[PDB]
Design a protein around this ligand. Structure first.
Ligand SMILES: [Mg+2]
Ligand SMILES: [Mg+2]
Ligand SMILES: [Mg+2]
Ligand SMILES: [Mg+2]
Ligand SMILES: [Mg+2]
Ligand SMILES: [Mg+2]
Ligand SMILES: [Mg+2]
Ligand SMILES: [Mg+2]
Ligand SMILES: [Mg+2]
Ligand SMILES: [Mg+2]
Ligand SMILES: [Mg+2]
Ligand SMILES: [Mg+2]
Ligand SMILES: [Mg+2]
Ligand SMILES: [Mg+2]
Ligand SMILES: [Mg+2]
Ligand SMILES: [Mg+2]
Ligand SMILES: [Mg+2]
Ligand SMILES: [Mg+2]
Ligand SMILES: [Mg+2]
Ligand SMILES: [Mg+2]
Ligand SMILES: [Mg+2]
Ligand SMILES: [Mg+2]
Ligand SMILES: [Mg+2]
Ligand SMILES: [Mg+2]
Ligand SMILES: [Mg+2]
Ligand SMILES: [Mg+2]
Ligand SMILES: [Mg+2]
Ligand SMILES: [Mg+2]
Ligand SMILES: [Mg+2]
Ligand SMILES: [Mg+2]
Ligand SMILES: [Mg+2]
Ligand SMILES: [Mg+2]
Ligand SMILES: [Mg+2]
Ligand SMILES: [Mg+2]
Ligand SMILES: [Mg+2]
Ligand SMILES: [Mg+2]
Ligand SMILES: [Mg+2]
Ligand SMILES: [Mg+2]
Ligand SMILES: [Mg+2]
Ligand SMILES: [Mg+2]
Ligand SMILES: [Mg+2]
Ligand SMILES: [Mg+2]
Ligand SMILES: [Mg+2]
Ligand SMILES: [Mg+2]
Ligand SMILES: [Mg+2]
Ligand SMILES: [Mg+2]
Ligand SMILES: [Mg+2]
Ligand SMILES: [Mg+2]
Ligand SMILES: [Mg+2]
Ligand SMILES: [Mg+2]
Ligand SMILES: [Mg+2]
Ligand SMILES: [Mg+2]
Ligand SMILES: [Mg+2]
Ligand SMILES: [Mg+2]
Ligand SMILES: [Mg+2]
Ligand SMILES: [Mg+2]
Ligand SMILES: [Mg+2]
Ligand SMILES: [Mg+2]
Ligand SMILES: [Mg+2]
Ligand SMILES: [Mg+2]
Ligand SMILES: [Mg+2]
Ligand SMILES: [Mg+2]
Ligand SMILES: [Mg+2]
Ligand SMILES: [Mg+2]
Ligand SMILES: [Mg+2]
Ligand SMILES: [Mg+2]
Ligand SMILES: [Mg+2]
Ligand SMILES: [Mg+2]
Ligand SMILES: [Mg+2]
Ligand SMILES: [Mg+2]
Ligand SMILES: [Mg+2]
Ligand SMILES: [Mg+2]
Ligand SMILES: [Mg+2]
Ligand SMILES: [Mg+2]
Ligand SMILES: [Mg+2]
Ligand SMILES: [Mg+2]
Ligand SMILES: [Mg+2]
Ligand SMILES: [Mg+2]
Ligand SMILES: [Mg+2]
Ligand SMILES: [Mg+2]
Ligand SMILES: [Mg+2]
Ligand SMILES: [Mg+2]
Ligand SMILES: [Mg+2]
Lengths: 48, 275, 92
RNA sequence: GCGAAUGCCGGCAUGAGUAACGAUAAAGAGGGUGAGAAUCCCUCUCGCCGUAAGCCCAAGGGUUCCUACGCAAUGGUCGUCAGCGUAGGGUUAGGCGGGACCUAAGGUGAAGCCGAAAGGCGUAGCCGAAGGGCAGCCGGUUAAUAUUCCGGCCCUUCCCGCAGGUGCGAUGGGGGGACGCUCUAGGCUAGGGGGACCGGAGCCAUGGACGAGCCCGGCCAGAAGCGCAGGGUGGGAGGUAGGCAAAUCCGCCUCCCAACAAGCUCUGCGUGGUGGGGAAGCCCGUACGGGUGACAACCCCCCGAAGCCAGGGAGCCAAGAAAAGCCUCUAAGCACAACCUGCGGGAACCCGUACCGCAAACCGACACAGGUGGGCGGGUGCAAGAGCACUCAGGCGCGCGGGAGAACCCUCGCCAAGGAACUCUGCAAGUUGGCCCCGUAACUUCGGGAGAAGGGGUGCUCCCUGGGGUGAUGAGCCCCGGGGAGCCGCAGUGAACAGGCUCUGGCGACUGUUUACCAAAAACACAGCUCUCUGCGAACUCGUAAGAGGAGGUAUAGGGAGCG
RNA sequence: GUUCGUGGAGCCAUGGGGGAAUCUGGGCGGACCACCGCCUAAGGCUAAGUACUCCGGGUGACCGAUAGCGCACCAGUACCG
């Protein structure tokens, strides 16, 4: 069987990345709620 | 006639293949006037609209120029008859005296090297493009045009041929392969003779493949549905049809004139459908 | 502004094994360029350098107590020097 | 103001020193370190994988890699060990994979269109890859880096100066790049097996044997040139409305000729200047490993690929991408310029590079019996083969063991006589099993049933003989056989991998698909048949609309419904 | 919309159809008519008084680490997805 989380750098970056938020009207809602809540990592960071 | 098979395996006993005898004119295909990739997509921007299309084999589009006023009065030379997976009929790779590559669907009974001209100064032989007022009455004709200078759209399938049934002033009366006596205008172009490949009816697809080769997904029947999707769905052990005849969107599928009644493309027909 | 250059020689055992040849490796500024290092050594050290080769060293995650952090992310360079002359200031 | 809300939070109990300690591949012994050793290091035996339980990459993970010092915590036990903690090092690229090259699905998006706003379509163009193009092979070095560092050797891009030649020159045109599936003829290579030939430290065990005795290795890379095997391409003249033309380029028609060819270009292989490697065994061996035995040998024969020539050839329908580099012709421009080939000198940038990568480091809360893409993946025998059995190189003994050998559970083996009598049912288990040779019915859509059912043989030794391939025509070496004569055992695919069969009905034509994670079916699908609608700005569907699917389709087409 | 939900349904804006006048011209005083009163629509701007506390300070019959904001502590962190 396959588990649910089969990780991928490029799929995670183009799916949950910063511009992947900012090109949508709801991703700006995300980027204005994470700053008010005070998260240190506003976008899930992809390690290089 | 028909390429057949003895039943050496099951799902081969009835599988018949059309005759590939006119295809001997060229074994490869000229890669000059067909560079456009046919983007094969069953759907619009997201939604499957035409249900159960897609799949199948990769197919490359052949750019035809059925606008026969591209070169008026310039003769041609039919040098090849080749296969076309887009249309249902084989096309004619024909050269020009001018020297320009051109793909035209091949009418009934072409050969190699005869002369054909897309102009009004043309005698009656199978292949020429002539206006409908210059088409004689009773002559079978195909690739006719509905409104002038809009290409060629009517009667382009295999074996079909419209026929001139008289004239009414400036509009000519011609019958279509349904049997609908319709008037069109007199300077749109038309290619005489039938299309051919009339063995297209006589082929049998054989197995569940050759639908999945061509790209038709399995068309699931409506009696095995659920009542969420189809009005015919559900029921305990094949319940009978639920008192409509129905499509999956409510409208009745057997005997409903869903044509737009007040369409401005009406008033030209003087008949509807031959029974 | 001279946008200047080399932090320190790495003083490692492979560095001192490259001391016998013309290698003379060192840390650099992390946003440098392999032409800028030749420009840096041939002017700041007044020598002739044939073949610079750089490599990007990732820092190790490191903790002191119960608070986890990481060491910095910094680049290391070697400089293949033209023969005959060498540097006479790096004698560690 | 608490004792109740299967209340919550934190601690501690019962269950209890109980189950378990994680594939039934397997451990034993002697030394060393150490306070402490079944568990750490070394040595001698035994077992397991060996189409992997071995090796190389891309994912993924992010220092887990190496050394030194230690066991606070972790390892289903201990542990001096550790993929555990502290510190110090370690990833070196013009040629490898990406960007400074291009493009497909898709996304963004000048112009334009639509929508209360957020916004949604959308030409040109841009992004977008395990797709195309592009210049690197061999060996050594560290404890940790290697196609990068070094040794040999060969190339590419750009610029500068000189020599020679030319009508040079594009985001423009043109050919090419440019392609399916299956079967495959010829040559070569990777890989592999022998030799009575070459070289090597050794040995004659225990009964026989100083000999065609045993064991190991008999290579790799390599420019120009030369041979072998293929791929591509007709060479000139005129006319021509076309390449949304500007052409000497391309397309078409006239051809004195060549024409299954040859010439000219493009690959692969062998040889090739030369360079590197060079064992098994023996001494020094803590580890690591180092000297070694040489002046090492580096020769011949065969099997032979899915890999290379390759864009080969044949057949079939379901008809099998784009653009860029590069080749050629020109517009504006320039012809003291610009372009091409040589000769010398320079410049070649940013990121990845360690380790695990079919697992203890990836995903599964775990050092989890699960899953994870691509390549090499040996030898011997079973006809063959990635199957089966064993074993090279490589690793591993699975991180709890030691006793006794109760009932009982799982797995496996066997059994007098009956042979399905137990049960809802030959469920399960067992027989048949591989190959060759006779024979094979009812019925039929003439294919099939069918491997029907039933049987006979299979081991080893010797003799004769038909050939085929390489080699030279056979000597040598592999393959397909046939006949005769014997020998042993209960048993001769002597082990392992390998159909129980037939008749009769029901249902579904058949192959296939589904209820991930209790139902693989008489359910779904299917070819085919019938009905109905739609003539195109089609019908129908998504979307408020634009627009898109239909479809760059045309009643022999498309949509819906029903039976199959 | 105003309390106005179609009721006798005014007024304020209008999605559509018809459609003028410029003080002897119009609108309103809740179907409507006459009188009598109020005001000039079909252009635009305007501080002050009013709401709230990221932040600054003072107070509290406010609390005292299971309270108080989720965090008095290196917290929107470790951790889960
Ligand atoms: Mg072209
Ligand atoms: Mg069908
Ligand atoms: Mg159902
Ligand atoms: Mg649904
Ligand atoms: Mg319904
Ligand atoms: Mg680098
Ligand atoms: Mg209590
Ligand atoms: Mg309880
Ligand atoms: Mg509790
Ligand atoms: Mg006890
Ligand atoms: Mg017990
Ligand atoms: Mg008990
Ligand atoms: Mg126990
Ligand atoms: Mg055990
Ligand atoms: Mg022991
Ligand atoms: Mg001991
Ligand atoms: Mg001792
Ligand atoms: Mg032991
Ligand atoms: Mg990675
Ligand atoms: Mg992790
Ligand atoms: Mg660590
Ligand atoms: Mg240590
Ligand atoms: Mg410990
Ligand atoms: Mg422990
Ligand atoms: Mg100690
Ligand atoms: Mg380690
Ligand atoms: Mg460590
Ligand atoms: Mg780019
Ligand atoms: Mg650059
Ligand atoms: Mg691009
Ligand atoms: Mg482009
Ligand atoms: Mg596109
Ligand atoms: Mg797009
Ligand atoms: Mg958009
Ligand atoms: Mg690429
Ligand atoms: Mg590539
Ligand atoms: Mg080098
Ligand atoms: Mg030129
Ligand atoms: Mg060789
Ligand atoms: Mg010898
Ligand atoms: Mg003896
Ligand atoms: Mg040999
Ligand atoms: Mg040998
Ligand atoms: Mg060689
Ligand atoms: Mg071959
Ligand atoms: Mg192109
Ligand atoms: Mg590596
Ligand atoms: Mg390594
Ligand atoms: Mg694998
Ligand atoms: Mg794990
Ligand atoms: Mg374990
Ligand atoms: Mg595991
Ligand atoms: Mg797999
Ligand atoms: Mg045998
Ligand atoms: Mg064999
Ligand atoms: Mg096996
Ligand atoms: Mg071994
Ligand atoms: Mg062990
Ligand atoms: Mg153990
Ligand atoms: Mg264990
Ligand atoms: Mg027992
Ligand atoms: Mg018995
Ligand atoms: Mg018996
Ligand atoms: Mg019974
Ligand atoms: Mg009974
Ligand atoms: Mg059974
Ligand atoms: Mg051969
Ligand atoms: Mg069936
Ligand atoms: Mg299930
Ligand atoms: Mg099941
Ligand atoms: Mg459309
Ligand atoms: Mg139909
Ligand atoms: Mg049915
Ligand atoms: Mg009202
Ligand atoms: Mg009003
Ligand atoms: Mg209005
Ligand atoms: Mg009014
Ligand atoms: Mg009033
Ligand atoms: Mg006013
Ligand atoms: Mg405050
Ligand atoms: Mg608190
Ligand atoms: Mg307290
Ligand atoms: Mg996370």
């Amino acid at each position: 069987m396959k588990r649910t989380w089969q990780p991928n750098r490029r799929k995670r970056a183009k799916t949950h990345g910063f511009r992947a938020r900012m090109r949508t009207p709801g991703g700006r809602k995300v980027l204005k709620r994470r700053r008010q809540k005070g998260r240190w990592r506003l976008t899930p960071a992809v390690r290089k | 006639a028909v390429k057949k098979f003895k039943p050496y395996t099951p799902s081969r006993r009835f599988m018949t293949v059309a005759d590939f005898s006119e295809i001997t004119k060229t074994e490869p295909e000229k890669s000059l006037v067909k560079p456009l990739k046919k983007t094969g997509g069953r759907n619009n921007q997201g939604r499957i609209t035409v249900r159960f299309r897609g799949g199948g084999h990769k197919r490359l589009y052949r750019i035809i120029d059925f606008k026969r006023w591209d070169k008026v009065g310039i003769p041609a030379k039919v040098a090849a008859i080749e296969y076309d997976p887009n249309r249902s009929a084989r096309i004619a790779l024909l050269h020009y005296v001018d020297g320009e590559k051109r793909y035209i669907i091949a009418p009934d009974g072409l050969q190699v090297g005869q002369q054909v001209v897309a102009g009004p100064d043309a005698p009656i032989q199978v292949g020429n493009a002539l206006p409908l007022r210059f088409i004689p009455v009773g002559t079978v004709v195909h690739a006719v045009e509905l409104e002038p200078k809009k290409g060629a759209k009517l009667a382009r399938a295999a074996g079909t041929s419209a026929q001139i049934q008289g004239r009414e002033g400036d509009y000519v009366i011609l019958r279509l392969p349904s049997g609908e006596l319709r008037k069109v205008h007199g300077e749109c172009y038309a290619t005489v003779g039938a299309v051919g490949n009339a063995d297209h009816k006589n082929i049998v697809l054989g197995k569940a493949g050759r639908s999945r080769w061509l790209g038709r997904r399995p068309h699931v029947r409506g009696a095995a549905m659920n009542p969420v999707d189809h009005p015919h769905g559900g029921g305990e052990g094949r319940a009978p049809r639920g008192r409509p005849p129905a499509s999956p969107w409510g409208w009745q599928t057997k005997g409903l004139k869903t044509r737009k009644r007040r369409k401005p493309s009406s008033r030209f027909i003087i008949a509807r459908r031959k029974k | 502004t001279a946008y200047d250059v080399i932090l320190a020689p790495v003083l490692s055992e492979k560095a001192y094994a490259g001391f016998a040849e013309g290698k003379y490796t060192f840390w650099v500024h992390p946003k440098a360029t392999k032409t800028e290092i030749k420009n840096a050594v041939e002017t700041a050290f007044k020598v002739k350098v044939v073949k610079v080769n750089t490599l990007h060293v990732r820092g190790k995650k490191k903790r002191l107590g119960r608070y986890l952090g990481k060491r910095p992310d910094r680049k290391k360079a070697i400089v293949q020097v033209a023969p005959g002359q060498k540097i006479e200031a790096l004698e560690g």
